Amino acid sequence: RTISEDILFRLEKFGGILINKTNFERIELDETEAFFLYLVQNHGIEIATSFFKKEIEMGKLERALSLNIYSDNPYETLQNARKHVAKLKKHNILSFPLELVIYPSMYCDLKCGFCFLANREDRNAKPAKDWERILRQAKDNGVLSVSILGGEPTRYFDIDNLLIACEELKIKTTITTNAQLIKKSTVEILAKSKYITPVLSLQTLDSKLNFELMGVRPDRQIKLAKYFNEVGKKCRINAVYTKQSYEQIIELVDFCIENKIDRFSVANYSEVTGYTKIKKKYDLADLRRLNEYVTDYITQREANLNFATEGCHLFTAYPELEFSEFDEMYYGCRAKYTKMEIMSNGDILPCIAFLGVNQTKQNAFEKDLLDVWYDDPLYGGIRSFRTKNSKCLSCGLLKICEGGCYVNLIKEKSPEYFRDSVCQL
Numbered sequence: 001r002t003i004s005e006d007i008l009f010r011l012e013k014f015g016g017i018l019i020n021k022t023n024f025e026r027i028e029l030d031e032t033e034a035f036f037l038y039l040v041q042n043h044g045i046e047i048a049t050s051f052f053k054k055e056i057e058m059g060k061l062e063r064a065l066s067l068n069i070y071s072d073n074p075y076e077t078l079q080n081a082r083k084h085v086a087k088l089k090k091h092n093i094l095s096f097p098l099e100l101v102i103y104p105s106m107y108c109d110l111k112c113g114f115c116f117l118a119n120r121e122d123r124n125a126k127p128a129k130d131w132e133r134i135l136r137q138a139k140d141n142g143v144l145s146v147s148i149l150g151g152e153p154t155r156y157f158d159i160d161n162l163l164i165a166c167e168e169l170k171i172k173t174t175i176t177t178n179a180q181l182i183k184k185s186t187v188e189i190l191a192k193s194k195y196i197t198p199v200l201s202l203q204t205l206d207s208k209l210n211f212e213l214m215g216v217r218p219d220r221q222i223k224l225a226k227y228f229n230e231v232g233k234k235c236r237i238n239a240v241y242t243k244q245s246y247e248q249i250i251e252l253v254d255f256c257i258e259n260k261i262d263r264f265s266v267a268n269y270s271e272v273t274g275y276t277k278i279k280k281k282y283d284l285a286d287l288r289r290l291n292e293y294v295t296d297y298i299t300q301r302e303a304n305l306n307f308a309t310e311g312c313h314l315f316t317a318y319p320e321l322e323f324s325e326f327d328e329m330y331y332g333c334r335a336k337y338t339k340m341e342i343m344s345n346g347d348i349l350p351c352i353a354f355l356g357v358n359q360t361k362q363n364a365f366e367k368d369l370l371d372v373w374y375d376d377p378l379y380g381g382i383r384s385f386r387t388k389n390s391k392c393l394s395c396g397l398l399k400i401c402e403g404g405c406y407v408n409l410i411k412e413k414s415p416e417y418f419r420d421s422v423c424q425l
């Protein structure tokens with residue numbers, strides 16, 4: 001009798017953290033409860049119940065015992081947990097990323113005008129065996145989910161094996177695809193997968209506009225969504241808000257409903273100078289007005305569709321706004337504590353935005369992900385950045401924002417004083 005496989009437990013500098021690996025609801029734990037549950041994980045609830053005897057009689061474990069997180073040398077493990085919690089404190093960082101992002105291949109078969117990762121160099125793409133080692137560290141270190149991107153990942157030669165490794169390691173994984181040339185075998189590995197969920201890149205059902213945006217008709221993305229619904233497999237649609245009208249968005253919502261799409265995400269359009277070709281039409285305010293339009297539509301028709309907008313600093317469109325020790329590191333720029341991205345050559349980046357930063361990056365094929373997660377200059381830089389902008393210093397969201405996206409700030413003359421134009425508050 002231990003902790004459920006559907007529950008993610010990790011020791012943190014403030015105790016511990018529990019998260020459902022399917023519901024995504026989370027609970028912050030004491031140091032007592034975290035040490036308690038750590039034993040309950042590495043030993044039985046009995047061996048754990050032995051320790052903390054006084055605490056259980058003091059009522060200090062009334063909550064931790066009142067949870068539904070259970071399923072079917074403790075001195076040295078309790079000591080090592082203490083050695084761990086102390087190290088996290090002396091670094092003041094999250095234990096491990098909750099999100100790992102991997103780019104097994106930068107090659108893609110398309111050249112979407114809105115994309116910033118097209119035509120990239122894809123020379124010596126490592127095989128799934130090498131990524132398997134990386135995946136094992138992530139699993140063993142407490143990662144919550146592994147997102148497979150690119151590039152078109154389905155055009156990655158060893159994609160089938162890589163997907164198998166994620167299924168065998170039982171890591172909550174997603175793969176995002178244009179669905180153009182996806183192999184039959186691959187579609188099967190996804191159809192009979194319990195842990196992997198496909199995401200389909202689809203800008204619209206309108207053939208012309210989608211062809212202008214991606215350079216293909218939406219036919220194959222539509223076909224695959226329809227197919228997964230047949231074999232009863234969870235599927236998702238991801239679109240970038242670039243040129244779509246409201247009417248075209250709603251048309252795409254209805255498609256998700258009819259075909260029972262798990263989640264429909266509309267990402268904010270991020271311009272990257274020198275790479276993105278299309279001009280940005282809508283800001284974050286326009287994205288909020290859209291979100292409040294779609295949710296008002298999905299509910300005004302009684303649909304169980306899981307809708308969302310995505311991007312950084314989306315909160316800057318809400319002027320209507322004390323964070324917990326975890327929330328301070330969870331909300332806002334994920335590149336600080338909750339995210340890691342691994343390039344095709346093994347380059348480790350806090351964020352994909354660091355592709356254009358000409359600083360040195362460590363290799364995930366030579367070094368360990370946890371070492372880098374502790375001692376890496378790029379992480380230290382973004383983590384330790386503090387803005388001196390007057391508006392920001394008096395802003396309620398300073399702790400999670402720090403004057404905007406760090407990667408943009410360090411490009412400016414006086415980054416500590418420059419506020420990101422995305423915020424006009």
Ligand SMILES: C[S@@+](CC[C@H](N)C(=O)[O-])C[C@H]1O[C@@H](n2cnc3c(N)ncnc32)[C@H](O)[C@@H]1O
Pocket residue numbers: 108114115116117149150151152153176177178199200201202238239240267268269270271276
């Ligand atoms: C990293 S991309 C590439 C992976 C894969 N080739 C695909 O198209 O799904 C994953 C998602 O990012 C989205 N995307 C691409 N460029 C973007 C941008 N400039 N801003 C926001 N989202 C973007 C795409 O729609 C895609 O669904």
Ligand code: SF4
Pocket residue numbers: 108109110111112115116117118150151152178201214
């Ligand atoms: S968005 Fe995906 S399909 Fe389009 S070029 Fe970028 S990487 Fe390829």
Ligand code: SF4
Pocket residue numbers: 316391392393395396397398401402403404419420423425
């Ligand atoms: S940029 Fe400044 S004012 Fe705007 S959300 Fe971030 S800290 Fe607050």
Ligand code: SF4
Pocket residue numbers: 312333334335336350351352353404405406407
């Ligand atoms: S570094 Fe910038 S682009 Fe990357 S998550 Fe942080 S805010 Fe977003």
